[PDB]
């Protein structure tokens, strides 16, 4: 049984000269998500933005920092970027699936992928969850 597994995992490494194939095998790693996970990631991102805004109005002579409160509010600030990048890496596959049908004209394929990635960054910035829809519907526009 292991012969087919070794073949399917050994023929891919030898033939890998395509950067497109490299990127596809790259993005196949991060698993997809669902609605409540997206809502929770959006909450964590917005918590991080309000945490760094509290640090921003701190950044003058606002207050002498309580220690544990300071370190875990900076944990909140740094943790929202982790949720942000996680959601980005999740919807890379959506970017590819939308960008695939504009090829064969004008430009190369990886350039279209990267521009769709930048549009996904803009969408995941300006995304709202309180309207209660799927992220893909709102992100497809920006992509």
């Amino acid at each position: 049984s292991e012969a087919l597994r070794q073949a399917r995992k050994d023929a891919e490494l030898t033939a890998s000269a395509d950067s497109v194939r490299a990127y596809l095998k790259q993005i196949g790693k991060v698993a997809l998500l669902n609605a409540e996970e997206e809502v929770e990631l959006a909450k964590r991102i917005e918590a991080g933005l309000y945490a760094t805004q509290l640090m921003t109005e701190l950044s003058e002579r606002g207050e002498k920092l309580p220690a544990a409160q300071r370190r875990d509010m900076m944990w909140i600030c740094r943790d929202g970027d982790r949720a942000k990048n996680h959601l980005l890496e999740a919807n890379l596959r959506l970017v590819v699936s939308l960008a695939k049908r504009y090829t064969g004209r004008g430009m190369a394929f990886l350039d279209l992928i990267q521009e769709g990635n930048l549009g996904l960054i803009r969408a995941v910035e300006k995304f709202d969850y309180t309207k209660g829809y799927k992220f893909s519907t709102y992100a497809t526009w920006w992509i």
Binding site: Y23, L88, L110, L118
Partner: peptide
Amino acid sequence: RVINRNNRLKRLIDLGAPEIIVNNEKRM
């Protein structure tokens, strides 16, 4: 192609971008 990919990389760095897109743009 070189100028476009350079400016795209530069804007990605100035924005702050997750790692896969950065290494993708560097390889491109």
